[PDB]
Amino acid sequence: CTCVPPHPQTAFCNSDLVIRAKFVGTPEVNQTTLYQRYEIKMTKMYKGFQALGDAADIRFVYTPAMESVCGYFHRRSEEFLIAGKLQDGLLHITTCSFVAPWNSLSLAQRRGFTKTYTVGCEECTVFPCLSIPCKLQSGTHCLWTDQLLQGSEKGFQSRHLACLPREPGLCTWQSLR
Numbered sequence: 001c002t003c004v005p006p007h008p009q010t011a012f013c014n015s016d017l018v019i020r021a022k023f024v025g026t027p028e029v030n031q032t033t034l035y036q037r038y039e040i041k042m043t044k045m046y047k048g049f050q051a052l053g054d055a056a057d058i059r060f061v062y063t064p065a066m067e068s069v070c071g072y073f074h075r076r077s078e079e080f081l082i083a084g085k086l087q088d089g090l091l092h093i094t095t096c097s098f099v100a101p102w103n104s105l106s107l108a109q110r111r112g113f114t115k116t117y118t119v120g121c122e123e124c125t126v127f128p129c130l131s132i133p134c135k136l137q138s139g140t141h142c143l144w145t146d147q148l149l150q151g152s153e154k155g156f157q158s159r160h161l162a163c164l165p166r167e168p169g170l171c172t173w174q175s176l177r
Contacts, residue, residue: 001069001096003070003095003096005098006096008098008112008113009117009163010125012112012117012118012121013117013118013121014085015047015083015098016048016085016086017047017082017083018047018083019043019048019082020044021043021079022078022080023038023039023074023080024040024041025040029065030065034065034066035063035065035090038062038063039060040082042059045058046113046114058091060091061084061093062091063092063093063095067095071094072094072095078101078102078103079101079103080100080101081101081102081105081113082097082099083113106159106160107177108160108161108177109159109176111176111177112162120162120163123140124142124165125140126141126142127141127142129147129148139170140169140170140171141163141171142157142172144157144158157173160176160177162176
């Protein structure tokens, strides 16, 4: 698997559903498709609820059953934020999907997933900076220079900021606290 983990904003923007859930199964491999299925119990829906209303129940999430093709392998108690894509009728995640304990999120991340990340999806893009040199090539991009860090998921941009309109033609990294 050679995927690159997206910024939480990018994960929110690109996902069809964003939910909170406990993992309850032991997961099972479907022998015909070779997707692994996890059972969950969903406690909240943060994106999708406009379409599915209060009927929204998501009981299963799917991933490739092999590590090599980007399956997510879940590491007992905890509610998780899951940001997934709907593919061929199923909610899918990969090892690059944003999936994490709700209690491990910063207050800013919780604000982004519930309210603020949506503000940047139409207008702004978190652009990668995976090696030196890297270039900021458009005014509507925010350059994710935290990707140079060892603990990149815990950088300031990743953990406390969003890429949001600032002026006509210009997005910037902005504090969610």
